Amino acid sequence: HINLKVAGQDGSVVQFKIKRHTPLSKLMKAYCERQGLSMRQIRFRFDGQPINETDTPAQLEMEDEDTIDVFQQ
Template structure:
């Protein structure tokens, strides 16, 4: 299942924007077109709203490293079509 979400849209060229995929282990995927300077908090919040989980229960990983709220794609060295992995925290006995 694939959804598209536009976090930033202003009609400018692709030099300031990148396309990233956010995918959970169950295969739910959302594509984002974001500015290289957009805080990842925005992407995380929108994705969690789409899947119906609280942000506190979800972990976002890029190249195996956890993504912090205040980092940007530029900080992380992200390129077009990069993948962000999502892990939903399991609670229970």
Template sequence: MAETDQKPDINASEHVNIRVVAQDGNVVQFKIKKKAQLRKLMTAYTERLGLQEGSVIFLYDGLRIQREQTPNDLGMEEEAQLEVMMAQEGGG
């Protein structure tokens, strides 16, 4: 039997690096599993910066991200970039 059967690179396929860019240009990088809910990233980001979770929103390709979504759900590739903005209340 030929040794053409190669094991897939598990690390490359299970995780994705995501850059979170704030309005002031500050960048925080995360590495998470593609099947993990983005809730983990959002919580880690707000805790790291001392913010309340509801005080910011996260956008991917200009669309607001839901906490239950995963990188796979959004089709994120390696070095995906999220924008984070201060949430605005009101309207009137």
């Protein structure tokens, strides 16, 4: 498992742990659920790159304690 932060533009930082070869849609759906947000209303990015359904941490070269940025659509 790697630990990841999800930072909103309001400064909120919400924490997840994910295995390196698990798709990040696990984390994305979880965030939407936990935070009462529509998948429809938001996008997730890492190092500027948008994150897709099957993107994995290992594939986006994410490391423990890295930050994913969340935005409005």
